[PDB]
Paper text:
Here, we demonstrate the determination of the crystal structures of T. brucei GMPR; a protein that, unlike the GMPRs of host animals, possesses a CBS domain.
Thus, it appears that GMP induces the transformation of TbGMPR from a “relaxed” (C318A apo) to a “twisted” form (C318A/GMP). Two GMP molecules were observed in each subunit of C318A/GMP; one was found in the active site, whereas the other was bound to the cleft between the catalytic and CBS domains. The interactions between the active site and the substrate GMP molecule involved 12 hydrogen bonds and 7 C–C contacts. The interactions between the base moiety of GMP and three amino acid residues (Met401, Ala402, and Glu428) in the catalytic domain appeared to stabilize the α-helix and a portion of the following loop structure that were disordered in C318A apo. The ligand GMP molecule at the allosteric regulatory site formed 10 hydrogen bonds to and exhibited 13 hydrophobic interactions with the amino acid residues in the CBS domain; at the same time, the O6 and N7 atoms in the GMP molecule interacted with Arg93 in the catalytic domain via hydrogen bonds. The structures of the isolated catalytic and CBS domains in C318A/GMP could be well-superposed with the respective domains in C318A apo. However, the relative orientation of these domains was obviously different between C318A/GMP and C318A apo: the CBS domain is rotated ~40° between these two structures, a change that may be induced by an interaction between the base moiety of GMP and Arg93. This hinge motion is inferred to contribute to the transformation from the relaxed to the twisted octamer.
Author numbering:
A (entry chain A), B (entry chain A), C (entry chain A): 3 to 416, 424 to 489
The structure:
Amino acid sequence: FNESASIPTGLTYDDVLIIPQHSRVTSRKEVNTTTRLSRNVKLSIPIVASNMDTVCEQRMAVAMAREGGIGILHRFCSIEEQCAMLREVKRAQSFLIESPRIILPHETAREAWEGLNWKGRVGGVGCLLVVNCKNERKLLGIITRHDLKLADESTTVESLMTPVDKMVVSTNTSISLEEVTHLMRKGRTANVPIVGQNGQLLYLVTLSDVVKLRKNKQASLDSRGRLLVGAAVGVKKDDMNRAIRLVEAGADVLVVDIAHGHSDLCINMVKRLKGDPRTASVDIIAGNIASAEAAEALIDAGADGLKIGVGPGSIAITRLVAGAGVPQLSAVLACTRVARRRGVPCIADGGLRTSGDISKAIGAGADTVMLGNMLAGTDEAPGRVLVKDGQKVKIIRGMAGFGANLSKAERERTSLVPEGVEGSVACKGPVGPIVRQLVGGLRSGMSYSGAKSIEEMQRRTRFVRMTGAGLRESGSHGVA
Amino acid sequence: FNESASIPTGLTYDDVLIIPQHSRVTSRKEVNTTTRLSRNVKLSIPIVASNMDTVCEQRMAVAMAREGGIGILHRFCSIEEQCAMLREVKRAQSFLIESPRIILPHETAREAWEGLNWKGRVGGVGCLLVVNCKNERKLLGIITRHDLKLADESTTVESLMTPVDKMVVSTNTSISLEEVTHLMRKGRTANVPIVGQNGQLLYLVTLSDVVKLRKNKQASLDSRGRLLVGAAVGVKKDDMNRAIRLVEAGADVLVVDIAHGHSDLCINMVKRLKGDPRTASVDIIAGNIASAEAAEALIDAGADGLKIGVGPGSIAITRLVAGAGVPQLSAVLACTRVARRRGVPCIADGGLRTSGDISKAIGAGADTVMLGNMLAGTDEAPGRVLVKDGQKVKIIRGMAGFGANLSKAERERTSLVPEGVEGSVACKGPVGPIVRQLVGGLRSGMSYSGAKSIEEMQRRTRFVRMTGAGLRESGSHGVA
Amino acid sequence: FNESASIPTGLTYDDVLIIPQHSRVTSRKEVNTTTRLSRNVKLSIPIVASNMDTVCEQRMAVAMAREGGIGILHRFCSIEEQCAMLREVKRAQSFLIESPRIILPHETAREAWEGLNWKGRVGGVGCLLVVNCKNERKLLGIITRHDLKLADESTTVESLMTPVDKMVVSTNTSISLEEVTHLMRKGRTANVPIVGQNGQLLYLVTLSDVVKLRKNKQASLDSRGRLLVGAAVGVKKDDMNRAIRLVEAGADVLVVDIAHGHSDLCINMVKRLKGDPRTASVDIIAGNIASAEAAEALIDAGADGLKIGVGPGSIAITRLVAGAGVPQLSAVLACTRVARRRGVPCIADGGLRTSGDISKAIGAGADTVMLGNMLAGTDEAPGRVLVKDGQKVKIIRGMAGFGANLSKAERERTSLVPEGVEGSVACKGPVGPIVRQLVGGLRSGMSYSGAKSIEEMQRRTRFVRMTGAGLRESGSHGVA
Ligand SMILES: Nc1nc2c(ncn2[C@@H]2O[C@H](COP(=O)(O)O)[C@@H](O)[C@H]2O)c(=O)[nH]1
Ligand SMILES: Nc1nc2c(ncn2[C@@H]2O[C@H](COP(=O)(O)O)[C@@H](O)[C@H]2O)c(=O)[nH]1
Ligand SMILES: Nc1nc2c(ncn2[C@@H]2O[C@H](COP(=O)(O)O)[C@@H](O)[C@H]2O)c(=O)[nH]1
Ligand SMILES: Nc1nc2c(ncn2[C@@H]2O[C@H](COP(=O)(O)O)[C@@H](O)[C@H]2O)c(=O)[nH]1
Ligand SMILES: Nc1nc2c(ncn2[C@@H]2O[C@H](COP(=O)(O)O)[C@@H](O)[C@H]2O)c(=O)[nH]1
Ligand SMILES: Nc1nc2c(ncn2[C@@H]2O[C@H](COP(=O)(O)O)[C@@H](O)[C@H]2O)c(=O)[nH]1
Ligand SMILES: [K+]
Ligand SMILES: [K+]
Ligand SMILES: [K+]
């Protein structure tokens, strides 16, 4: 039976351990996890939230960027819906707030409360600038939640506002962080509007944003100090329109995402996106792939990053429906060998269950990991909490399954051989502490490889293969 | 321990994945699944229903041919019974209906209803031609279910019939599909009898059959426009008599089927079948085999197709009773290497659980797959629905087990070391949608291999081996 | 502890058995199950499908009426939606079809096919009458599915139609069933339009409807030969508008349905419905109640029928959330004692698990039973089939639970302490055979009471109480 002997063996994460190496690491603090998402996008931590409609919408994208990673907004929504989520992410924080929310002086406190609970930002906004009219936005004063706390619904805005002559106001549209910090410290105020030469409202700077920018600059930020966020598109004719509008909404990267990324459909979508100035202003990531030849083709088509993984996802059953796939450790090894020589970062997407798997993925050459299941069921993941026979749970479902595709039909106003499933995950709490523990686990693995950086982790890691017997010894055994 | 190291390793479907390849496939519609069952028999889809007495009798054979595959009628029945199932399959549809059912004009509506519910076709027939007597069949008119809907049981046929002078009748025994379509369109009628020069009834053409022939020519048809169907025989002296009578009944292929096909018993049965003009008019398929040497021997004996599989069947325990077998992927690889050079198609028989396994079998060189378990418990599978501790189930049982062999004794009017078992499967509904989903899964696997045809799938597919750890990552993991 | 001793004991179905009595019943056919739903509505069988959004929409209501029972359309939909379901039920069959579907002669076969698949009747319609224009409906001919079977999408209706001068047409707007049967038998036709003095189309009579009316008159029919159907309303101001529109749509009874029917809200809704001529034309049923005092109050308010049951429903948890309820056998006994003296039929609603429970409910005085769980998951029940960890299932959910109430918000375009739950039931197949088996079980229980009628069952039944030990002996014990 000679044909069988020539078939190569592919490995997944559970097939290997990282071999301990000489470590000069003395402090857990010396281990730097900064990495590249794509050719022109750096991240403080190598964690990407999956573009799944049970993992990443605006609340997850905001949380991931705040931890120093990023979320990819899923495309199983209308273009209008996807862009709206993106604008909400961009609205979470800023340095100079463009188009700050305003109100007119003859309006009521009831209308002030409605403006403060603006649906354009999760949590609303903390102040409204009082202006004479919508067209001129001549600044008359400012009103905050605090100023409304004892008001009757009928009380006028101007009766409760701080007038502009009592405000600290600037005309410096280039004001620095140090300068506005000085104005707030000296003026003992929490809001500095920026106005034009005719007193018209141009920007707002808030103490909340200044405090964040002065603190740990872990957060993933664009050039305006807003949170970084990506968005997924498909490969159909209409996806080009989606891509253009996502970039207009502020997308920092686009992710071309189809099950079989080694296809002309994906290669031609990448070429189209790099060929149009309306979309070529942002890095184009493409997947999903699992071979050296596929990496070469997508890189040659112009991809700024590659997403690796055919079948390993928790809710994925491509391997059961089509029979196709590559064990994920071998896929990462093969794809990153090609990509590293061309300078193209790779996302290891799918099949990760523990922080230990993240260490292995980075050790096998990945620059980032993409997580679905490990982040599903967190507070910030979309969906309702449900009681699944006793405990609190949330839905996780494949994007090639029935549930996600009927929901894509219900949201976009519209013969499926499914390649994903639906299930529940236990509610995990806020995603922040979970991400921090995963990064802490990665740092432990880097210390075992003697690595103080991601590039050192990729260069220094050596693996040893284990049998099923070795795998059992690796988890907890013999206790209850 | 050197002897052990020289034993080769055989692989089954769960040992490998199809490696994704460059795909130029743009539309799911561009993927053609047409294939060969045997040297002279083509099929639109590569699915064969197993010759098991819990899988394929007349209703399953009809359904499979209608989907573009085929069923193999099992031989655990009397010759008379096997031939009767075959004639019912052939009676399901036709272009020219030979010996159409008739009735005499002085008969009653009660007798008309009995003739319409003729046991020679599942569902009966829709019309009876009224003729003067059984010997001359001079056409007097036609009576349909519609004409009986308000009749009393005592009303005469001729009182309710449409008379012949009001019918559209032809004398063209070579009438084309376009010509009879024109006669039906112009005559605004649903039945065109074909009569001889003396008005005697020769054939009938019905609108139902014309509509089918005008629609999607997916269905597996013989030269008369009837559904294709095969039949199994053994290797005993009496099996030659069974074979002759099956061919007379309309069998389109014969399948010589014994557990150990690499035996003189099987080789000599193939030689006997090719040597007799009463059976050599149809392709002779033989199995079951699992080695290159076995393929060579059966091909040299004259086989037009090979059936591959020793032990992998869901209900099979040959490997537990005799200890013999070959892991099915390696068996397909080895057998098809020999057979492809001789032009002999191969059926991968047994051990298939998902559409993904079908993609692997075709990728390993098989031209068709044979399914037992995946089709058992469908509406069209034989047997009664049963309640197995709550839910609706149907029996599936091995043909070398006790249950099937006592039933073979009860049907043919008649020291077993069993090599099959009995069990239940959940009721699956109609087989049609299940077959369509399996073919859809296969098309997905072909797209991953970049293949637009079965021959391209066989040439282009490359496998990667996975460990048990890789297999776990391949299904659903970490969700409920 | 004397206070405790004075609390009476309530019984449920599992607490009692029907004591066998002297039976003169010789044939299973002698047992008549005809009963009253309400003062002025009779049913051939005593089975009512529950007004739950997982049990009864138009397909279930049609099936129940065809078996001789009735369905109550649920109100967790817009008024427009509830009325639309009702009109579809009324459209399922008729004697004189009002406003039969028409088409114009210059239209295409493609437009004919669209008219035949009219969404106003489940399954569409079988013919379209060809008329000169929508305003006059002068009959020009008729076109059927059969006439389109060989047409091109572009072929004109008038080219394919049967012209009116070749049709059998009547001007008798009072035509009897015997007379139209004669016209169809003599004319050898399946459609008899009824036209006016100027040839304008007034009604259509079809052979399908005639055959049904000639067969077993088991079906629950209104005076026009359409299927009987009821509809639920609440007790809010807007429910009066819903009630008026339901009656206009053809509702044969209205069911005032709230959890606590012994309340001024329910009593005043009944009084309002009986007091308005727009709703007083149909029987008003009210519930849910569980005491003699409650029956007296609703009867005094004018109820034509009572629905009995507080808490016993399969998906109901009123008893766990509020702590209130009455064991269902005792509730039926107490309520029917009052109602029988006033001539008001009672529906035993909830907690029924087997046909044996139905016999007990009727024996305890109920005129009908209402079933949710036993009919959920049938083909005709609403909702999608789902795979719940292996087998095919359908959702069943309480109308006071979260799932049904969010769906009521999604359908009507809109602080819940839930009193119902959600769950799955195994798919049961078509509801018809299930209903027939339940009625067969009831007939067996009636035979044990020596009863040949429902009234005899209510008068003759005697119960014996069993302990938990007796209950175990009653089901299957000691076998696998
Ligand atoms: N006041 C105000 N804050 C905004 C607006 N848009 C976004 N934000 C964000 O909302 C946060 C304000 O926090 P606060 O202290 O106002 O609750 C900051 O991160 C700020 O950038 C806006 O229009 N007005
Ligand atoms: N084959 C397949 N992969 C999916 C499907 N849905 C999500 N995925 C993949 O699974 C990844 C998540 O993997 P997880 O971290 O949950 O194991 C996603 O980022 C995506 O690449 C699906 O329906 N089919
Ligand atoms: N009328 C008629 N149909 C037959 C006979 N034998 C087989 N059939 C098949 O029964 C089907 C007729 O459908 P119908 O429209 O008659 O229900 C066709 O597929 C036809 O070929 C026969 O003897 N008479
Ligand atoms: N060894 C053995 N094979 C069987 C027996 N019965 C059926 N088979 C094989 O099992 C195949 C069905 O495999 P399945 O698709 O159910 O896994 C049949 O086509 C036949 O080759 C049996 O009793 N013993
Ligand atoms: N032809 C026709 N049938 C209707 C219409 N509305 C309801 N139906 C019902 O549809 C059924 C007709 O069955 P057919 O034989 O037309 O398939 C009958 O029960 C009939 O009452 C209509 O407008 N036209
Ligand atoms: N208390 C309560 N009863 C319900 C609820 N939903 C349905 N029901 C009752 O339960 C009955 C169905 O009972 P089943 O036949 O499923 O045991 C319905 O007809 C209705 O009276 C609910 O959410 N709460
Ligand atoms: K361990
Ligand atoms: K998987
Ligand atoms: K018993």
